């Protein structure tokens, strides 16, 4: 019902800062998924001419 | 203006023409887009 004993907030904040370690800089991160459906494939990679 | 829609392999292809002035003519209806959507289309 509230902050207090057995309830914690569960999302906390990085506070990213210039003079941190390598280990703590921020990355951007992107993943590709890429999806193989019973339709046509409207996605393909570049063809040099 | 004629139109035609079918539904083939994903592709949805229609085909259309513009003249003057019914049955006293002739004219075949040109492809003009072609979008493969993959739905299937029963009813319209």
Known sequence: ?49 | REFVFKNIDGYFKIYSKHTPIFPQGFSALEPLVDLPIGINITRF
């Open chain 1, 1 to 49: 019902k509230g902050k207090g004993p057995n309830c914690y907030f569960p999302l906390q904040s990085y506070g990213f800062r210039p003079t941190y370690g390598v280990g703590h800089q921020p990355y951007r991160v992107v993943v590709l998924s890429f999806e193989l459906l019973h339709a046509p494939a409207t996605v393909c990679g570049p063809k040099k001419s």
